Structure formats: C-alpha cells, structure tokens
Amino acid sequence: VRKMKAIYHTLNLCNIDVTQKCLIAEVWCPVTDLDSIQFALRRGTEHSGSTVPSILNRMQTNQTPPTYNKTNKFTHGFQNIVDAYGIGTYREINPAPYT
C-alpha cells in the first residue's frame, strides 16, 4: 500500500493531456539509464493490458540537473561527508575518489 501511495504521488507529479486521457512526464536520466528505462517501459506497458507504445522524446535543450554520483557500500560514506559540505556543480570534478 505504501508503494501504491508512492505511485499515486508520482502520478500526481505530471501534466494531464487534453487531446487524449494521457499524461506527459519529464525525467532527467543519463543515457545508460535511458536505455534501461526504454526496456523497462516495454516491460511496464506489457504488464498493462493496453501495451501503449509510451513514446519518450529526448530533449536537446539541457536544464541545470541534479548531481548524480554512483556510490557503493564502501564509497557511499565518503560521498556523504563530501555532500555534507555541499552538492557539487553538474559535471564538476568529484572530490570523493580522492577523499
């Protein structure tokens, strides 16, 4: 149920189309993730009975993104003590590998 709520919350964070009872949503994701997502989208739409193609259109325009740093069980702690000082500029040199 908590997950259900989470889903509905996310679904609220969208724009409702007028032409068709469809929603358009924007996500910020790297290409690696975008390929994984396209595959995920096929899986998702396949679970839904309508198998809607669900087109995701890449945006050429770039909007100041959040900073995504991949960490693991060991390096996560070091990234946090970096983040404690501040979140680095997008495409900034990450100090954590040196920390």
Partner 1 sequence: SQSQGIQQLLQAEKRAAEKVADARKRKARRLKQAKEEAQMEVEQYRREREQEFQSKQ
> DSSP strand E in 1-99: where?
15-16, 23-24
* Closest approach of partner 1 to the CB of residue 27, in Å: 13
* Closest approach of partner 1 to the CB of residue 55, in Å: 7
* Closest approach of partner 1 to the CB of residue 14, in Å: 14
Which residues lie below 8 Å from residue 29, measured CB to CB, with a gap of 6+? 37
List the one residue out of 32, 33, 27 whose CA is nearest residue 56: 27
Cβ nearer to partner 1, comparing 12 with 19: 19
Q: Whole-angstrom Cα distance, residue 50 to residue 33?
A: 24
In the three-class reduction of DSSP (H, G, I as helix; E, B as strand; rest coil), residue 52 is classed as coil
Cβ nearer to partner 1, comparing 48 with 57: 57
Q: Which residues bind partner 1 (CB under 8 A)?
A: 17-20, 24, 55, 57, 59
Cβ nearer to partner 1, comparing 57 with 72: 57
